[PDB]
Amino acid sequence: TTFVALYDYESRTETDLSFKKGERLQIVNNTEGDWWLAHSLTTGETGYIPSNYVAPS
Amino acid sequence: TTFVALYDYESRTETDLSFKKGERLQIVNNTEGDWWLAHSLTTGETGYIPSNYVAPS
Numbered sequence: 001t002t003f004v005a006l007y008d009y010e011s012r013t014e015t016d017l018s019f020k021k022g023e024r025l026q027i028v029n030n031t032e033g034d035w036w037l038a039h040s041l042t043t044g045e046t047g048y049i050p051s052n053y054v055a056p057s
Numbered sequence: 058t059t060f061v062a063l064y065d066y067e068s069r070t071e072t073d074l075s076f077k078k079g080e081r082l083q084i085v086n087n088t089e090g091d092w093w094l095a096h097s098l099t100t101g102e103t104g105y106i107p108s109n110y111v112a113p114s
Contacts, residue, residue: 002098003111013070017095017104025111028094028103035092035105037085038074041059046085047074048092054060054082 002026059083 003025011018033052060082068075090109
Protein backbone atom coordinates (compact mmCIF):
# COMPACT_ATOMS: atom_id res chain seq x y z
CA THR A 1 0.00 0.00 0.00
CA THR A 2 1.12 3.59 -0.73
CA PHE A 3 -0.08 6.44 1.51
CA VAL A 4 -0.38 10.16 0.79
CA ALA A 5 0.39 12.87 3.33
CA LEU A 6 -2.60 15.04 4.17
CA TYR A 7 -0.57 17.69 6.02
CA ASP A 8 2.89 19.02 6.37
CA TYR A 9 4.85 17.51 9.22
CA GLU A 10 8.09 18.79 10.80
CA SER A 11 10.40 16.32 12.56
CA ARG A 12 11.12 16.88 16.22
CA THR A 13 13.72 14.14 16.81
CA GLU A 14 16.39 12.46 14.76
CA THR A 15 14.12 9.44 14.18
CA ASP A 16 10.97 10.93 12.78
CA LEU A 17 10.40 11.72 9.12
CA SER A 18 9.62 15.24 7.95
CA PHE A 19 7.25 15.41 4.99
CA LYS A 20 5.07 17.77 2.98
CA LYS A 21 1.40 17.49 2.19
CA GLY A 22 1.10 15.38 -0.95
CA GLU A 23 4.18 13.23 -0.41
CA ARG A 24 3.81 9.54 -1.19
CA LEU A 25 4.95 7.25 1.62
CA GLN A 26 5.36 3.47 2.04
CA ILE A 27 5.24 1.74 5.40
CA VAL A 28 8.27 -0.17 6.64
CA ASN A 29 7.15 -3.31 8.44
CA ASN A 30 9.54 -4.48 11.12
CA THR A 31 9.89 -6.32 14.41
CA GLU A 32 8.88 -3.31 16.50
CA GLY A 33 5.31 -3.01 15.30
CA ASP A 34 3.42 0.28 15.38
CA TRP A 35 4.54 2.64 18.09
CA TRP A 36 2.12 3.87 20.70
CA LEU A 37 2.27 6.65 23.27
CA ALA A 38 2.11 4.93 26.65
CA HIS A 39 2.13 5.68 30.34
CA SER A 40 3.76 3.30 32.82
CA LEU A 41 1.69 2.54 35.87
CA THR A 42 4.80 1.04 37.35
CA THR A 43 7.14 4.08 37.05
CA GLY A 44 4.94 7.03 36.20
CA GLU A 45 7.03 7.69 33.06
CA THR A 46 5.42 8.34 29.67
CA GLY A 47 6.60 8.07 26.08
CA TYR A 48 6.44 6.01 22.89
CA ILE A 49 6.74 2.24 22.95
CA PRO A 50 7.15 -0.45 20.36
CA SER A 51 3.82 -2.22 20.45
CA ASN A 52 5.12 -5.69 19.58
CA TYR A 53 6.85 -5.58 23.04
CA VAL A 54 3.59 -5.62 24.98
CA ALA A 55 0.42 -7.66 25.25
CA PRO A 56 -3.04 -6.96 26.70
CA SER A 57 -3.34 -7.69 30.40
CA THR B 58 -7.13 -1.53 28.39
CA THR B 59 -3.92 -2.19 30.37
CA PHE B 60 -0.93 -3.83 28.65
CA VAL B 61 1.98 -5.78 30.11
CA ALA B 62 5.53 -5.56 28.82
CA LEU B 63 6.86 -8.86 27.50
CA TYR B 64 10.49 -7.68 27.27
CA ASP B 65 12.81 -5.09 28.60
CA TYR B 66 13.13 -2.04 26.40
CA GLU B 67 15.81 0.69 26.53
CA SER B 68 14.99 4.17 25.19
CA ARG B 69 17.07 5.50 22.34
CA THR B 70 15.65 9.04 22.09
CA GLU B 71 14.21 11.55 24.49
CA THR B 72 10.66 10.63 23.39
CA ASP B 73 10.51 6.90 23.85
CA LEU B 74 9.66 5.15 27.10
CA SER B 75 12.09 2.75 28.74
CA PHE B 76 10.43 -0.15 30.54
CA LYS B 77 11.10 -3.53 32.12
CA LYS B 78 9.47 -6.83 31.39
CA GLY B 79 6.35 -7.05 33.54
CA GLU B 80 5.58 -3.33 33.66
CA ARG B 81 1.93 -2.35 33.29
CA LEU B 82 1.31 0.29 30.63
CA GLN B 83 -1.72 2.28 29.45
CA ILE B 84 -2.03 3.73 25.97
CA VAL B 85 -2.34 7.48 25.51
CA ASN B 86 -4.76 8.22 22.69
CA ASN B 87 -4.08 11.47 20.89
CA THR B 88 -4.36 13.36 17.63
CA GLU B 89 -1.23 11.78 16.14
CA GLY B 90 -2.48 8.22 15.96
CA ASP B 91 -0.13 5.25 16.01
CA TRP B 92 3.29 5.96 14.61
CA TRP B 93 4.63 4.00 11.69
CA LEU B 94 8.07 3.65 10.15
CA ALA B 95 7.78 5.06 6.64
CA HIS B 96 9.83 5.71 3.54
CA SER B 97 9.15 8.73 1.34
CA LEU B 98 9.00 7.99 -2.35
CA THR B 99 9.16 11.71 -2.89
CA THR B 100 12.42 12.46 -0.98
CA GLY B 101 14.04 9.11 -0.30
CA GLU B 102 14.06 9.89 3.45
CA THR B 103 12.89 7.35 6.04
CA GLY B 104 11.66 7.59 9.62
CA TYR B 105 8.61 7.47 11.89
CA ILE B 106 5.42 9.28 10.99
CA PRO B 107 2.21 10.08 12.77
CA SER B 108 -0.31 7.89 11.00
CA ASN B 109 -3.30 10.22 11.39
CA TYR B 110 -1.39 12.57 8.97
CA VAL B 111 -1.67 10.21 6.02
CA ALA B 112 -4.30 8.32 4.07
CA PRO B 113 -4.18 5.37 1.67
CA SER B 114 -3.53 6.34 -1.94
